[PDB]
Amino acid sequence: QAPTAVLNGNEVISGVLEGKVDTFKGIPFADPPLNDLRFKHPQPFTGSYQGLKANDFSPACMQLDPGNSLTLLDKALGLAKVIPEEFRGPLYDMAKGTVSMNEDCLYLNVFRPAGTKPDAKLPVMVWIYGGAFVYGSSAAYPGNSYVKESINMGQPVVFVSINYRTGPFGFLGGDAITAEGNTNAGLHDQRKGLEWVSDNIANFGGDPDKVMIFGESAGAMSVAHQLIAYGGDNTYNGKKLFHSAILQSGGPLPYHDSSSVGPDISYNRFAQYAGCDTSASANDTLECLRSKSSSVLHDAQNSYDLKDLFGLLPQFLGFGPRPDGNIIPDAAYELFRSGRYAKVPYISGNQEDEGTAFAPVALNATTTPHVKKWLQYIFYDASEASIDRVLSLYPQTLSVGSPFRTGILNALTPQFKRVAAILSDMLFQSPRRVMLSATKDVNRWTYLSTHLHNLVPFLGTFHGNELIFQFNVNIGPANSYLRYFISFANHHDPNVGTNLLQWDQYTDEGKEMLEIHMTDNVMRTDDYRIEGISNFETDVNLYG
Ligand SMILES: *[C@@H]1O[C@H](CO)[C@@H](O[C@@H]2O[C@H](CO)[C@@H](O)[C@H](O)[C@H]2NC(C)=O)[C@H](O)[C@H]1NC(C)=O
Ligand SMILES: *[C@@H]1O[C@H](CO)[C@@H](O)[C@H](O)[C@H]1NC(C)=O
Ligand SMILES: *[C@H]1O[C@H](CO)[C@@H](O)[C@H](O)[C@H]1NC(C)=O
């Protein structure tokens, strides 16, 4: 029997019973962003839900193939040699998929315990993806393991995943988009999905007054931008859109302006790869981009990734959230430090070796001059003095680079461990500490995951790896990532009924941090590489 829910008082949608979980997949929350609506803010859904058979995932939004990155990594270090088969199988499974990709992709999915009734008021967990090596948008993140575990725990939740536009489709900047007021469209997509949840989740048995948003990599960077959206106003028609958050390996971005990697403006490069004439006026280039087929814009996006992000650099360094004076009113770091953020409790953490999967971009660097040149490209407006100070704080000494704590092993090149440490701390660890020290009036918890230490040559406990334990095979540290986060969605404290180590909250006095291992966890403090990370937190002259 198909489970049902009724929206707008009388429109009945049906889902699919999958074991003991009811699923409703492919629910539209905005009108399709096609033709004249390409690159514009999401428009209200003007259709009908009546008779919708929400029985399969919608198309994924336009994105790059993970194969680009996985093949470069494989060329650089031989993934089948370094990653144990039990983790490698899952990792490649999340990088492929049966869903198509299409610009018509603004849909969400609801997962709940079978037989939940609309009056149940179950806590809601809303997942926002952003995995560097994952294909499929929400289709790669089924909520069944989270829902099944919350039932076993006696703490049932509703899980929701939302699609949003990434890349140039969701974050095309430039003067024409600014003049239209259509900046940061992908962030507005997420916010519209959250409005849909506030208005409609009670019909599925969820509680609109207890919503947790969480995500990983660009999804955690998105959650951090939702916390400072409109200077911390997370209300919609008087109601708070979310009440707690978890950020897995991502935080605010250090930009104070719409900058991107390298010597050229990202808009200009993409327009050029799409075959538009970049000497025409701003409005004419945007009109040209709105006339191209999706395959042409897809090839153009692929060329920007391979040529300008070198197939590996985090996508938000090219097309991503930037200050626009409206949904992001000022630089993200400054909004957190002036208290202009939503006052909700959160968990923020990192994998030990966040930078190792990105370090192969600088594989040809053997000397400090070579590393300086790569850093001058990625951070093109950085002052030379600021770069020189980073290079003195992160030396080429093999034992202090990343994979961390591995001595003289894993030195793929003379500079690989150094570049992996710099990218780790600049892009992931410093953003986490900017939030933890700025948000002193909310409860917060932080973690370091070291569970693959010494099991994966050259990569260590790398960026994006923990997603296989949350969404694919529930082995290794899966119980920590499932149960602490279910407890947090229910009680805004990770320690209720987990049967796991007590995780003490982070305080400014003790800087308490959970360290997650393969089978056990231990408490530690967030005390490592203080000088190096602190400099990234405070040197504004690095960023552009
Ligand atoms: C490492 O590779 C990069 C990318 O090919 C080289 O940098 C380029 O060098 C040419 C000539 O100086 C410039 O026109 C490019 O614009 C540079 N691009 C970047 C991203 O820096 C770099 O010279 C190589 N380093 C070594 C030691 O060979
Ligand atoms: C460009 O488009 C904007 C927003 O649609 C409009 O207000 C402006 O007049 C246009 N300007 C030119 C020079 O075409
Ligand atoms: C939709 O139909 C099912 C019967 O399969 C029923 O249990 C459910 O209550 C209906 N939905 C609502 C919200 O009435």
In whole angstroms, give the CA distance from residue 181 to residue 280.
21
DSSP string, 27-79: EE-S----GGGTTSPPPPP-S--TT-B-BS--PBPS---HHHHHHHHHHHH-H
Q: Is 322 within 8 Å of 184 (Cβ atoms)?
A: yes
For residue 371, the one-letter residue type is V
The DSSP output letter for 274 is T
Tokens linked to 41: 């803010």
Cβ-proximal residues to 429 (8 Å cutoff; 6+ apart), any chain: 350, 354, 529, 533, 536
Q: Is the dihedral of CA 374, 377, 382, 385 positive or negative?
A: positive
- CA angle at residue 206 from 203 to 208, to 5 degrees? 95
| Cα dist from 448 to 121, 220, 461, 463, whole Å | 32, 15, 10, 12
φ and ψ at 81, to 5 degrees?
-85, -40
| Cβ neighbour number for residue 468 with a 10 Å cutoff | 23
The DSSP output letter for 353 is B
Nearest to 162 by CA among 132, 133, 201, 123: 201
In whole angstroms, give the CA distance from residue 368 to residue 373.
9
Q: Is 510 within 8 Å of 355 (Cβ atoms)?
A: no
Nearest to 452 by CA among 438, 434, 469, 439: 469
Q: Which residues does residue 346 pair with via DSSP β-bridges, in sequence order?
A: 245, 444
Cβ-proximal residues to 85 (8 Å cutoff; 6+ apart), any chain: none
For atom 9 of ligand 2, which residue has the closest CA?
Answer: 179
Edge-to-edge strand ranges of the sheet holding 512-516: 16-18, 21-28, 107-113, 158-162, 122-128, 206-216, 244-248, 346-351, 444-449, 512-516, 521-525
In whole angstroms, give the CA distance from residue 375 to residue 372.
5
Tokens linked to 470: 């949350």
φ and ψ at 306, to 5 degrees?
-70, -40
In whole angstroms, give the CA distance from residue 522 to residue 443.
20
| Counted domains in the chain | 1
* Domain, as residue range, for 211: 2-544
Name the method of structure determination.
Answer: X-ray
| Cα dist from 72 to 96, 133, 316, 335, 477, whole Å | 16, 12, 19, 37, 28
Strands 444-449 and 346-351, sheet pairing: parallel
In whole angstroms, give the CA distance from residue 28 to residue 127.
16
φ and ψ at 514, to 5 degrees?
-80, 135
Domain with 457 in it: what CATH number?
Answer: 3.40.50.1820
Q: Is 519 exposed, middle or buried (0-12, 13-18, 19+ CB in 10 A)?
A: exposed
Ligand 1 atom closest to the CA of 374, numbered from 1: 21
The DSSP output letter for 497 is S
Q: If you measure from the C-alpha of residue 290 to the centroid of ligand 2, how many angstroms do you get, rounded to a whole number?
A: 15
Cβ-proximal residues to 254 (8 Å cutoff; 6+ apart), any chain: 331, 332, 333, 430, 431, 536, 542, 543
Q: Is 60 within 8 Å of 139 (Cβ atoms)?
A: yes
In whole angstroms, give the CA distance from residue 163 to residue 408.
43
Cβ-proximal residues to 132 (8 Å cutoff; 6+ apart), any chain: 66, 69, 217, 218, 314, 315, 357, 463, 464
Q: Which residue has the tokens 């010597």?
A: 263
Q: How far is CA 202 from the centre of its chain?
A: 26
Q: How far is CA 496 from the centre of its chain?
A: 26
Q: If you measure from the C-alpha of residue 128 to the centroid of ligand 3, how many angstroms do you get, rounded to a whole number?
A: 28
The DSSP output letter for 505 is P
- CA angle at residue 350 from 387 to 460, to 5 degrees? 85
Resolution of the experimental structure, in angstroms: 1.8
Q: At 173, is the secondary structure helix, strand, or coil? A: coil
Q: Is 332 within 8 Å of 432 (Cβ atoms)?
A: no
CB of 5 within 6 A of ligand 3: the answer is yes
Q: If you measure from the C-alpha of residue 91 to the centroid of ligand 3, how many angstroms do you get, rounded to a whole number?
A: 38
Q: At 211, is the secondary structure helix, strand, or coil? A: strand
Cβ-proximal residues to 536 (8 Å cutoff; 6+ apart), any chain: 254, 390, 425, 426, 429, 430, 542
CB of 50 within 6 A of ligand 2: the answer is no
CB of 115 within 6 A of ligand 3: the answer is no
Cβ-proximal residues to 188 (8 Å cutoff; 6+ apart), any chain: 41, 42, 327
Please report, in angstroms and rounded to a whole number, the separation of the first and last CA atoms in the chain.
56
In whole angstroms, give the CA distance from residue 207 to residue 202.
6
Nearest to 26 by CA among 191, 165, 139, 115: 139
Nearest to 352 by CA among 393, 398, 397, 401: 401
Nearest to 261 by CA among 174, 319, 176: 319
| Cα dist from 15 to 21, 61, 130, 144, whole Å | 10, 22, 26, 14
Q: Is 472 within 8 Å of 258 (Cβ atoms)?
A: no
CB of 257 within 6 A of ligand 2: the answer is no
In whole angstroms, give the CA distance from residue 391 to residue 368.
8
Q: Is 28 within 8 Å of 109 (Cβ atoms)?
A: no
